Amino acid sequence: WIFNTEIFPTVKEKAAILTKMLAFEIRGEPSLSKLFYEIVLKLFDQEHFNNTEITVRMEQPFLVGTRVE
């Protein structure tokens, strides 16, 4: 979903569906959370001075991602 451009009309729906994936470490699933923080890290990889993300990826899962043991 995230890593391509299409007629999906806004990126806030991608943001709201990806921000829900912070329950993987709360419920106790390490592998799904590892994949999720890998794709958040890849979203921050292909950006130097860019907004290929939306700015809520810099807000919640980046900051929780600096804590993930």
UniProtKB/Swiss-Prot annotation:
Location(s), subcellular = Nucleus
Cystine pairings recorded for this chain? none
How does the record describe its quaternary structure?
Answer: Component of the 1.8 MDa SAGA (Spt-Ada-Gcn5 acetyltransferase) complex, which is composed of 19 subunits TRA1, SPT7, TAF5, NGG1/ADA3, SGF73, SPT20/ADA5, SPT8, TAF12, TAF6, HFI1/ADA1, UBP8, GCN5, ADA2, SPT3, SGF29, TAF10, TAF9, SGF11 and SUS1.
The record's family statement is: Belongs to the PI3/PI4-kinase family. TRA1 subfamily.
- Function, as annotated: Essential scaffold subunit of the transcription coactivator SAGA complex. SAGA acts as a general cofactor required for essentially all RNA polymerase II transcription. At the promoters, SAGA is required for transcription pre-initiation complex (PIC) recruitment. It influences RNA polymerase II transcriptional activity through different activities such as TBP interaction (via core/TAF module) and promoter selectivity, interaction with transcription activators (via Tra1/SPT module), and chromatin modification through histone acetylation (via HAT module) and deubiquitination (via DUB module).
**UniProt miscellaneous comment:** Although strongly related to the PI3/PI4-kinase family, it lacks the typical motifs that constitute the catalytic site of PI3/PI4-kinase proteins, suggesting that it may lack such activity.
* Domain notes from UniProt: The C-terminal domain (2233-2836) is essential for its ability to interact with activators. The FATC domain and precise positioning of the C-terminal carboxyl group are required for stability and function of the protein.
Q: What is this protein called?
A: SAGA complex/NuA4 acetyltransferase complex subunit TRA1
Q: Which organism is it from?
A: Saccharomyces cerevisiae (strain ATCC 204508 / S288c)
Name of the encoding gene: TRA1
Q: Which residues of the full protein are shown?
A: 2359 to 2427 of 3744
